[PDB]
Design a protein around this ligand. Structure first.
Ligand code: HEC
Ligand code: HEM
Ligand code: HEM
Ligand code: FES
Lengths: 383, 137, 72, 416, 39, 122, 85, 244, 364, 50
């Protein structure tokens, strides 16, 4: 047999990259996964080069970041990468979830895969948030403070878990040090989760924009979809350069460049942009315990989605009503993200409550109701 | 092994800033550094403690009461800022003659509530758990 | 004279900026009238011309901005 | 030996006293390559009609090749002259014979043959490979036509075909066996009477790298074929192309010598029994050729492995072929040429093909001398020119799910 | 391999092209061109 | 996922009643025309989620001609999606050719599965 | 599983289908890239526009109403209504 | 929030260094540093900038070194334990006018003039904001607003009240290259210098960005071509289905 | 010619300057040993000699350009070789070391022989016509010439049997070297100095040839999948080889593939006179769809009989042509084709395929 | 066998060995541009070690 199959290591590399029988009808959206993996490398790569200079002490975290920017040779490049690349990591992850929601990539044969997806999502958010707390700017510190205060709402253990998180009585040196350690670490746990993701993908393969089985026409991957992966990768890197080199702080918040001071809260507290939607949900629910439960449900209800989707046809590409519902859901998610950064004001409190209501109603009402209606409509129309 | 995550000596102790309650005189500023921030406190005077008990919480726009504010009766405290946005606290000035939010000249009551002036919300309490003949924060 | 002041003077005289300057000046007059009454200190709502000033300054900035650094 | 009779027709004979049996045949060029889609198969139908005539004790058979057609009357040596006259008659009355013919029965016979070449997996694979390689030109057409086109042929079509192609300038009388050449020539001259006419212009053809996949999952094997633009009968590399093909030679897994055949590919594919059988060939037409291999893979999971290894062994052609392989290929090609020229029927067919399509036939001794002049560097130059990194044409019939699409196999043609 | 060496060709080509276009587009602003006025 | 037994149950619940039939059926045809799968050569039953044991059995029990036609239609749909082009109106699948060919086999599969489930809980 | 390797991908018995193709190096690359990227892209956008526009129009109308109301509230004329809320 | 609270949004001045391919006007960086030392050093620290950072940007190494000797710094105390001081050197960071935040607040009516080494990346409008702030003071505060004692009205400051008070006035500084010192010119120069101080990699960053865009755009076009070429066989497939 | 072993040598010039050397072991064919021994022996011939192994002899032969095969025939075991005229001294020597001191190693019996023999048997029997012909020989010549031509697992053979059949056979009187395109004197010298000189004159304890014992009037049926085939077999004395060669060519023979013959007018039909040393079998076969074959075999039967003596005489020249075509180097043929009438009433019948459709002998 | 689809319009106008040479040129240019970019990035990162 060829060396690319006889050797176990090259056999694995072949099974996943060179001969993976990808369907012939996959759009460019299926490239997002590769980008995500690429980003996972970049986050790690630049990340490993920031810890070589980052000092996790609370009195040195911000000064250490500025030392990276000003003193290290390419330190500005490494930091701007590690940050805007996280922003792009979440852009690609949201696009990868949107693709999996539009096309029924979460349906039966791949439910397991979907589950790891969700877990990855959850884990990633933690990592990102934790990493952000390492900068220890104003917004960094106060985001950590708000997060821990909200987690203080667990019924009984809440009063005791928070000191274990803080490592003290407030966000301080132990908190930043443990965040740095767990932030260096959890990316490798996420790499393991990504390996599990790829295994669950390889067991049943990838879906199609048409939804129908691809087994009738499948293509290798080395001459096909590796050179499509290169288009997607180079577009990603071109936009990533337009951000990193030109206007690299657009995605960040200026207040993060003011060193953290517990005695002065900044005018507004917002997470980094990609966590804004969930933050909005958190504020839509008045109760703190209610808010945290509702938020974690907003993330976990993706697990319920494969069972609430009563559609006989995989995917939305051939479904009229479901496409409208999906785009309405996407735009409501963007609206939630927008409301996340806006102050809790007269119209916005009610608008955010309604947006959260519809966000959950999507999964638990609209997807099942619309899917059933469209099944009946398909059968009646053909007859 | 998970006990490492918990407050570390240098934190379990030292973080709780025990200070003698008896030393403070009733009328003056016993301005203290606590929770790594200002921690100003006055052991309550007998007349002042009584005056507060009589004062109606409903009368104040702020929804707070002296009884909830003070854990140990005579001994209590506030963290370091007269106004909701930090205002260095002046002593014995304001609507009730308790403190002046000098940064805006706003009025802080003996209660410490945002009695008047720019404070968006009433002044917070530096770890309010002071007890016995000592304080702690 | 510095270019910035002359640019503000030119812009505020522009037709687009004229209505904002108008509104701002009668706002000033109205607020001075409100300050004339002896009961001004007791009024809960003491008007101010911050909003009209902001509108005027935004409409003047939208004109000065593109031209100023050609003067320096 | 050659003699151009009256009418300008040429009688070419290769007489050998040791010949077991004699053969003489009239070939008039213009096979399927001279047809077009609507009237495809008319040459085969006409030749079958002519060959169905009374044999007067001889054995009258049709040729039906891609580019030339003819009727051959095999017979024992002493009877050869009679057979001569026979075919002459059959060709001097070709138009009459066609006119008086009820093409029904001959058309079911030709349709049966066309179905046969579409059922025998190797015949189907090679016919499809030729069609796709020369797609857009008459050379792509089947030799025997398709079942759809055969049924649509009528007598007037065959008459037009004969009138166009059965002319003196386009016909040759080939013979072999043990007989006096002059006697046969005289016998044919007195009896041959065919219309005058110019040799029809031979239609153009150009190779086009392509892939055709008739995947039938119901078959028990995968019958594939892969080839590059080869060498036509005119090219001086003709024998060089044959030597290059023989370097990789044949292979049948269940044959006793399967474990001992010289070619490296044979040793490579027996490690996991990748392939059941294969055979390398250099098909040569008048001006263009197809040089490649046919293969039957029993294990449907190893088609890709076989294609990969075979194309790697082709890559070896331009770099690492040793003098041992070149000498073996030379000897095997000489032996194959001598085997192909033993039966008098084969010798007659070869004489007709060469004389019609190249005008001159190189004797077997001249061919041996030309092959023995090949060195390893000549073979590697040919590999660089024609095999290394050149477009390939592919064909497959059944269980070809594992036959990776074109780009994989094409890129295999240049990786070291 | 030749990849390592060839990468130098393209890297140097683009680097010199940009480091010759940049100090021409910005010659009026760079330090080395302005230092004369303040010396 | 919704079973073809339940889908057909609801469809016959609607079709039996003239008011709902008149209101929906025009909307059903309009929805199926706007779905756009017919423009790619696919019949409705080609869209069905194949990756289920019931559905896998249903395809595995199709006749030869229907199986090969389904294979060709699926391949054509894949190619059309691959090349980002649609069949012209004359070549698209007409409403009368969308004949619900695979539904009976899926219904038989679900009947077998439902009887097995019912008898296991006898 | 529902997707085996190349030898057996789980596709049903396939038969009678002939797949023709031409090699690269013998086909016009980007044959209709310029004309297609305009006309076919416009066709695809035309087909898929409404599904993105109707939800977008609804959501952005809601957002515009909320934004305009919020801007109105914080003005010298919106003070009273802001107090009432 | 109210328009006053958010602060008037600074406009977009066409700075010499906005476009994707323009550097800082290093003449403006030098002039801005002059204005800084002359005016801003009375109140503002600007700690994260070391004299060495100025060599090759706005000052020749000799000038930066000389400016270093002009100041005193704390050295390791003598072997006898007594405190000792040394003239400044390039490696030393620029010193602020106050020993600690307590001193700064004491000397500025409690207001703490923030360190300017990140004031451009730590404000919404960036450079523009600083400019709009330094020239945003109106001669007459808008009618009706009452400022806390010691505060001056600046519409671009969130809340409308800023403890700074106008500092830049006409001809306050004699520029070294004879440039006129209008208040707008000084404001532009200071904003540019502070933007450099907050983004010393700006010029290098944008040059590297230009090189990266050239490389990646050429490579992306090549990838587009290669993919379309290698997919021509697939997009050109033609099928037939011919059952009996 | 001959040598002291009595090994006959025949040599004659060839047309295509290839020395198509061949050795014909007279009675080591499928008739001699127990059913299938000759097949395995033929598969052992060229593998391991006492002089050169398989992987050496095959490589050298391919370098020399020659071809070699071992085919089993009911009369004789034929070792064919084909090489350029320069190559005689090599191959002849090899052939000697093939007849003498062939190794017969068990690892070849299990890896190269039994697998190959089984594959060849399965491939041949997949053809209904060949299965029918084997059955026809079985039921016409019950033993000897009727032995299955190929190894079948129904009659297990152990290596010792094949080795002991190589010995006790291959004797000097039992092998006939035939060459085409090699000087008879040079070939005689090479054979005399090769291993052929060491073979015993005759086998001491085997090769007791049995009488032919032709049986007629029999029939058989062999159910099979796919294509069907009905065959009719006339046993014929050697002296009748002339009559039936003329008959076969008169109606259509496999050696002469041609339309216009009466038997070629019906699909799948053919005829052939298998010729052996002491008997022959004239087989008229039809193959294809069972329904087609049912009528085809009856039509072929009606054609074989009722052939006009005038047309039979006309077919004499075609029969002579067919005999000349068949007389290869390995299978020398000497049959005088006469037009004498040939009866068919004594036919055996065998049916293969859809036995529910194919007729019985009683329907002819 | 049958009539192939007409690719006349899709066929390239350029020489048989020339178009593959140009493909080699651009594939190698992509490879070496990628190598130069990787060299720049790796050098920039390792310069932090100094
Ligand atoms: C004397 C005291 C000075 C001088 C000479 C300058 N500044 Fe400014 N500064 C000063 C005070 C009292 C404050 C308090 C700010 C407040 O009340 O919130 C400041 C603040 C700033 C800021 C902060 C702006 C903001 O947070 O929105 C900036 C920016 C700033 N100062 C910059 C600056 C510049 C560029 C100067 C040029 C000469 C400058 N200051 C002079 C006090 C003083
Ligand atoms: C998917 C995985 C990761 C994501 C999404 C991610 C994301 C982020 C983000 C958004 C920040 C904020 C930095 C800023 O705003 O300036 C950050 C900080 C940081 N990250 Fe990562 N990161 C990942 C993995 C890693 C890894 C593996 C390391 C290994 C060292 C790492 C090291 C750091 C460090 C040291 C910081 C401090 C920021 C600084 O000093 O500027 N990260 N991360
Ligand atoms: C580092 C993060 C991730 C990596 C590297 C990764 C990897 C991949 C890869 C390589 C593919 C195949 C290409 C494609 O289908 O786009 C894929 C598909 C998929 N991604 Fe991920 N994944 C990641 C995160 C996620 C997350 C967070 C989710 C959902 C919450 C998710 C859901 C999916 C699903 C369901 C598929 C299958 C798509 C289909 O078959 O149609 N992935 N993933
Ligand atoms: S908040 Fe600044 S004065 Fe109370």
């Amino acid at each position: 047999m060829p060396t690319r199959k006889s050797n176990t290591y090259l056999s694995l590399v072949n099974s996943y990259l060179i001969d993976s029988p990808q369907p012939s009808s996959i759009n460019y959206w299926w490239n997002l996964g590769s980008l995500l993996g690429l980003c996972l490398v970049i986050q790690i790569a630049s990340g490993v080069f920031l810890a070589m200079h980052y000092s996790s002490n609370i009195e040195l975290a911000f000064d250490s970041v500025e030392h990276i920017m000003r003193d290290v040779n390419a330190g500005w490049l490494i930091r701007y990468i590690h940050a805007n690349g996280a922003s792009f990591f979440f852009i690609c992850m949201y696009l990868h979830i949107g693709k999996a929601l539009y096309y029924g990539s979460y349906k039966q044969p791949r439910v397991m895969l979907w589950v790891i997806g969700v877990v990855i999502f959850i884990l990633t958010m933690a990592i990102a948030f934790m990493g952000y707390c390492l900068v220890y700017g104003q917004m960094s510190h106060w985001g950590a403070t708000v997060i821990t205060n909200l987690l203080s709402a667990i019924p009984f253990i809440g009063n005791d878990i928070v000191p274990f998180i803080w490592g003290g009585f407030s966000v301080s040196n132990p908190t930043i040090q443990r965040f740095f350690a767990l932030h260096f670490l959890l990316p490798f746990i996420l790499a393991a989760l990504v390996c599990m993701h790829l295994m669950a993908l390889h067991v049943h393969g990838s879906s199609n924009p048409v939804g129908i089985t691809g087994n009738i026409d499948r293509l290798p991957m080395h001459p096909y979809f590796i050179f499509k992966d290169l288009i997607t990768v180079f577009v990603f890197l071109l936009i990533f350069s337009l951000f990193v080199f030109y206007s690299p702080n657009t995605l960040g918040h200026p207040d993060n460049y003011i060193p953290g001071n517990p005695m002065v809260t900044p005018p507004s507290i917002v997470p980094e942009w990609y966590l804004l939607p969930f933050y909005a949900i958190l504020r839509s629910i008045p109760d703190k315990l209610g808010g945290v439960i509702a938020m974690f449900g907003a993330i976990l209800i993706l697990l319920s989605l494969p069972y609430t989707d009563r559609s006989i046809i995989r995917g939305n590409s051939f479904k009229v009503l479901s496409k409208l519902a999906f785009y309405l859901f996407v735009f409501n998610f963007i609206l939630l993200g927008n409301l996340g950064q806006l102050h809790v004001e007269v119209p916005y409190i009610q608008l955010g409550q309604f947006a959260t209501a519809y966000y959950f109603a999507h999964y638990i009402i609209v997807v099942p109701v619309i899917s059933t209606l469209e099944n009946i409509l398909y059968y009646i129309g053909t007859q | 092994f998970l006990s490492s995550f918990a407050a570390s000596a240098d934190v379990l102790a030292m973080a709780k800033v025990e200070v003698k309650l008896g030393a403070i005189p009733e009328g003056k500023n016993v301005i203290i550094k606590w929770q790594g921030k200002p921690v100003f406190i006055r052991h309550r005077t007998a007349d002042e403690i009584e005056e507060a008990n009589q004062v109606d919480i409903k009368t104040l726009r702020d929804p707070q009461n002296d009884a909830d504010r003070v854990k140990k009766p005579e001994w209590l405290i506030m963290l370091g800022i007269c106004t909701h946005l930090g205002c260095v606290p002046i002593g014995e000035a304001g609507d009730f003659g308790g403190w002046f939010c000098p940064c805006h000249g706003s009025h802080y009551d003996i209660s410490g509530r945002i009695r008047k002036g720019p404070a968006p919300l009433n002044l917070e309490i530096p770890e309010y758990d002071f007890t016995d003949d000592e304080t702690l924060l | 004279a510095d270019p910035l002041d002359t640019l503000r003077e030119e812009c505020t005289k522009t037709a687009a900026c004229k209505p904002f300057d108008h509104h701002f000046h009668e706002c000033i007059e109205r607020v001075t009238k409100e300050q004339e009454e002896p009961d001004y200190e007791h009024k809960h709502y003491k008007e101010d011309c911050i909003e009209e000033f902001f509108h005027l300054q935004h409409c003047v900035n939208d004109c000065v901005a593109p031209r100023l650094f050609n003067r320096l | 030996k050659y003699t151009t009779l009256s009418n300008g027709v040429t009688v070419a004979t290769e007489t050998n006293p040791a010949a077991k049996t004699s053969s003489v045949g009239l070939f008039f060029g213009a096979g399927s390559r001279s047809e077009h889609s609507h009237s495809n198969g008319i040459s085969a139908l006409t030749t079958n009609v002519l060959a169905s005539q009374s044999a007067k004790g001889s054995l009258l058979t049709a040729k039906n090749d891609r580019e030339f057609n003819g009727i051959i009357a095999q017979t024992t040596n002493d009877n050869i002259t009679e057979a001569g006259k026979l075919i002459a008659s059959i060709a001097s009355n070709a138009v009459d014979i066609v006119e008086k013919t009820d093409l029904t029965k001959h058309k079911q016979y030709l349709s049966a043959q066309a179905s046969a070449v579409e059922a025998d997996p190797k015949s189907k694979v090679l016919s499809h490979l030729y069609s796709s390689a020369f797609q857009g030109y008459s050379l792509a057409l089947p030799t025997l036509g398709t079942t759809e086109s055969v049924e649509n042929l009528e007598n007037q079509d065959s008459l037009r075909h004969l009138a166009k192609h059965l002319v003196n300038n386009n016909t040759v009388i080939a013979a072999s066996g043990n007989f006096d050449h002059d006697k046969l020539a005289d016998a044919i001259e007195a009896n041959l009477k065919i219309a005058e006419g110019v040799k029809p212009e031979i239609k153009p053809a150009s190779f086009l790298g392509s892939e055709v996949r008739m995947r039938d999952d119901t078959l028990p094997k995968a019958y594939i074929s892969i080839a590059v633009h080869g060498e036509g009968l005119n090219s001086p590399n003709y024998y060089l192309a044959k030597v290059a093909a023989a370097i990789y030679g044949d292979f049948y897994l269940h044959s006793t010598i399967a474990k001992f055949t010289s070619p490296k590919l044979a040793s490579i594919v027996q490690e996991y029994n990748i392939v059941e059988s294969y055979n390398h060939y250099s098909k040569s037409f008048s001006d263009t050729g197809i040089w490649g291999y046919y293969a039957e893979i029993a294990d449907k999971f190893t088609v890709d492995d076989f294609t990969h290894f075979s194309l790697k062994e082709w890559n070896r052609l331009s770099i690492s072929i040793s003098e041992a392989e070149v000498a073996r290929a030379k000897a095997q090609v000489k032996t194959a040429l001598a085997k192909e020229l033993a039966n008098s029927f084969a010798v007659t067919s070869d004489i007709a093909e060469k004389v019609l399509l190249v005008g001159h036939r190189q004797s077997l001794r001249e061919a041996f001398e030309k092959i023995d002049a090949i060195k390893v560097n000549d073979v590697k130059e040919w590999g660089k020119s024609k095999v290394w990194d050149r477009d390939i044409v592919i064909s497959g019939t059944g269980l070809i799910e594992d036959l990776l699409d074109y780009n994989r196999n094409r890129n295999e043609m240049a990786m070291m | 391999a030749t990849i390592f060496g060839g990468a130098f060709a393209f890297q140097g080509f683009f680097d010199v092209a940009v480091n010759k276009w940049w100090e021409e587009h910005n010659k009026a602003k760079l330090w080395k061109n302005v230092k004369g006025k303040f010396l | 996922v919704q079973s073809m037994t339940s889908v057909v149950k609801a469809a016959n619940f609607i079709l039996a009643r003239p008011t709902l039939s008149k209101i929906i059926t025009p909307l059903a045809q309009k929805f199926t025309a706007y779905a756009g799968y017919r423009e790619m050569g696919l019949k409705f039953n080609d869209l069905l989620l194949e990756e289920t044991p019931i559905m896998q059995t249903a395809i595995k029990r199709l006749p030869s001609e229907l199986n090969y036609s389904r294979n060709f239609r699926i391949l054509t749909a894949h190619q059309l999606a691959l090349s980002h082009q649609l069949l012209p109106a004359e070549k698209a699948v007409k409403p009368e050719e969308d004949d619900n060919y695979l539904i009976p086999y899926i219904l038989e599969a679900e009947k077998e599965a439902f009887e097995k489930a019912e008898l296991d809980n006898i | 599983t529902y997707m085996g390797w190349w030898g057996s991908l789980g596709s049903p018995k396939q038969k009678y289908i002939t797949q023709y193709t031409i090699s690269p190096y013998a086909a016009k690359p980007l044959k209709g890239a310029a004309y297609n990227a305009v006309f076919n892209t416009f066709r695809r956008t035309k087909n898929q526009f409404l599904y993105v526009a109707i939800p977008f129009v609804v959501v952005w109308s809601i957002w515009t109403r909320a934004r305009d109301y919020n801007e109105y509230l914080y003005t010298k004329e919106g003070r009273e209504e802001l107090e009432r809320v | 929030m109210t328009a006053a609270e958010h602060g008037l949004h600074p406009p977009a001045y066409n700075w010499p260094h906005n476009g994707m391919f323009e550097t800082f006007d290093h003449a403006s960086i030098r002039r801005g540093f002059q204005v800084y030392r002359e005016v801003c050093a009375a109140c503002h620290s600007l700690d994260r900038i070391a004299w060495r950072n100025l060599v090759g940007v706005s000052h020749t190494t000799s000038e930066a070194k000389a400016m270093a000797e002009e100041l005193e710094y704390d050295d390791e105390p003598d072997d006898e334990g007594k405190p000792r001081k040394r003239p400044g050197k390039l490696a030393d960071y620029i010193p602020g006018p106050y020993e600690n935040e307590q001193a700064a607040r004491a000397a500025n009516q409690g207001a703490y003039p923030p360190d300017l080494s990140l004031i451009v990346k730590a404000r919404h409008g960036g450079s523009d904001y600083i400019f709009s702030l330094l020239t945003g003071y109106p001669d007459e505060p808008p009618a009706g607003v009452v400022l806390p004692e010691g505060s001056n009205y600046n519409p671009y400051f969130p809340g409308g009240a800023i403890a700074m008070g106008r500092v830049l006035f006409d001809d306050l500084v004699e520029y070294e290259d004879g440039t006129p010192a209008t208040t707008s010119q000084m404001a532009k120069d200071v904003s540019t210098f502070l933007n450099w101080a907050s983004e010393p990699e700006h010029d290098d960053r944008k040059k590297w960005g230009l090189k990266a865009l050239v490389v990646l755009s050429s490579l992306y076009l090549l990838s587009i071509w290669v993919k379309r070429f290698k997919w021509t066989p697939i997009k050109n497939r033609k099928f037939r289905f011919d059952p009996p | 010619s001959s040598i002291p072993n009595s090994v006959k040598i025949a040599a004659k010039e060839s047309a295509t300057d290839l020395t198509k050397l061949s050795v014909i072991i007279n009675n080591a064919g499928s008739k001699t040993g127990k059913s299938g021994v000759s097949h395995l022996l033929s598969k052992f011939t060229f593998l391991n000699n006492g002089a050169k192994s398989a992987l050496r002899f095959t490589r050298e032969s391919e370098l020399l350009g020659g071809t070699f095969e071992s085919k089993v025939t009911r009369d004789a075991l034929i070792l064919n070789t084909t090489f350029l005229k320069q190559d005689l001294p090599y191959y002849v020597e090899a052939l000697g070391n093939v007849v003498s001191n062939t190794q017969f190693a068990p690892h070849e019996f299990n890896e190269i022989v039994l697998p190959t023999a089984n594959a060849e048997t399965k491939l041949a029997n997949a053809n209904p016509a060949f299965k029918g012909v084997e059955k026809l020989h079985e039921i016409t010549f019950r033993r000897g010439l009727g032995n299955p031509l190929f190894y079948n697992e129904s009659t297990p053979i152990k290596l010792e049997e094949v080795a002991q059949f190589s010995k006790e056979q291959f004797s000097g009187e039992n092998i006939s070297i035939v060459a085409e395109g090699a000087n008879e004197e040079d070939l005689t010298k090479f054979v005399s100095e090769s291993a052929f000189c060491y073979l015993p004159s005759s086998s001491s304890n085997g090769a007791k040839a049995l009488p032919t014992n032709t049986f007629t009037g029999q029939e058989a049926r062999v159910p099979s999948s796919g294509a069907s085939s009905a065959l009719i077999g006339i046993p014929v004395k050697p002296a009748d080889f002339g009559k039936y060669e003329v008959l076969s060519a008169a109606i259509g023979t496999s050696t002469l593939p041609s339309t216009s013959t009466p038997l070629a007018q019906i699909p799948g039909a053919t005829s052939h006179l298998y010729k052996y040393q002491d008997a022959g079998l004239f087989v008229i076969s039809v193959s294809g769809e069972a329904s087609q074959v049912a009528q085809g075999i009856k039509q072929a039967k009606s054609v074989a009989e009722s052939v006009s003596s005038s047309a039979l005489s006309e077919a004499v020249k075609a029969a002579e042509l067919s005999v000349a075509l068949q007389s290869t180097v390995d299978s020398p043929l000497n049959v005088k084709v006469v037009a004498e009438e040939a009866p068919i009433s004594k036919f055996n019948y065998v049916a293969v395929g859809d036995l529910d459709v194919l007729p019985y002998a009683d329907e002819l």
